[PDB]
Amino acid sequence: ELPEDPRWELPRDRLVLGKPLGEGAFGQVVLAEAIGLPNRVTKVAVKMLKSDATEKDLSDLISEMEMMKMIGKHKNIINLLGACTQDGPLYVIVEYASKGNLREYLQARRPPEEQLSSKDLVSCAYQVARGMEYLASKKCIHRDLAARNVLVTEDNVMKIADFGLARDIHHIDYYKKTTNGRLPVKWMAPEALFDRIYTHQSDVWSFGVLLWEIFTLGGSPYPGVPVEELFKLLKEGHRMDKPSNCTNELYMMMRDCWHAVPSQRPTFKQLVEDLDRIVALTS
Numbered sequence: 001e002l003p004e005d006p007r008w009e010l011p012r013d014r015l016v017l018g019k020p021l022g023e024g025a026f027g028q029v030v031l032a033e034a035i036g037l038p039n040r041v042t043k044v045a046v047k048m049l050k051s052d053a054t055e056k057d058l059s060d061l062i063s064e065m066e067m068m069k070m071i072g073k074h075k076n077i078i079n080l081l082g083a084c085t086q087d088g089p090l091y092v093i094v095e096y097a098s099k100g101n102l103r104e105y106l107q108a109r110r111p112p113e114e115q116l117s118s119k120d121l122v123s124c125a126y127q128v129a130r131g132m133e134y135l136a137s138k139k140c141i142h143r144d145l146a147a148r149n150v151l152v153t154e155d156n157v158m159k160i161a162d163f164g165l166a167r168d169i170h171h172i173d174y175y176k177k178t179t180n181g182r183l184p185v186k187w188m189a190p191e192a193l194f195d196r197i198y199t200h201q202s203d204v205w206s207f208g209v210l211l212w213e214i215f216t217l218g219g220s221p222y223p224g225v226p227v228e229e230l231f232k233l234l235k236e237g238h239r240m241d242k243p244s245n246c247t248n249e250l251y252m253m254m255r256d257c258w259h260a261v262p263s264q265r266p267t268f269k270q271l272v273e274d275l276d277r278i279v280a281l282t283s
């Protein structure tokens, strides 16, 4: 069925499958221990299909894997480690982020899981801008950059997930909610949300939204605002308010990421330099 790839295959007996991770946002993922990769076990996350999965589901998953193979490694993205593709279920072994996604990570450290500093937060921004910059350099458009799609390792390293995901943009239901109850269209740039044009620029728009979340510690964008009301806000050029406990400088960065004209938004290469500078000057 699946063609062999000596470059990534791992014997099945080397992957001790463990407890399910998450509630199903990134599909069916489980924690596991990979022996070898010979006498050391490495905790990894394993992506697999469900029993009632369709051949389409199989295709897309294969597509996501081949995508991760072409893109290459980077500290700030979820990296592919191997795969079990022969004589059995397709197992995609990727890096494990023990602390889960960023949204919940940020929420869990809000003052009434210890509190994060201004530098810790600006450092989160930096790391994500860096994962994105590399992804952009590799010709990859994410299409759904949000705190929920950023995972945190036990060492607090921010990693972008879902970047190699397979998706027909001309099939996206604007009313479908995230598992947490939010509307993904709230992270979309106007041109993407309206004209279905995804570019590194629309990803930058999303980064502005992700920055907002960081500085509101898991804040939900546009609370109570439904899809049709959102369109109207965007049509009228509406921009979210500056989070309290946020410098004017970082709000301006958010505002620049949300520039009306795509060509005028900063690049990830630019944001990385700006964030690198800010982090150093941050208490």
Ligand SMILES: Cc1c[nH]c(/C=C2\C(=O)Nc3ccccc32)c1CCC(=O)O
Binding pocket: 021, 022, 023, 024, 025, 026, 029, 045, 078, 094, 095, 096, 097, 098, 099, 100, 101, 148, 151, 161
């Ligand atoms: C708590 C937690 C720890 N790890 C994870 C998930 C993942 C993980 O650790 N590595 C991955 C690679 C790709 C997709 C998901 C994961 C969760 C769940 C995160 C979630 O579903 O939002």
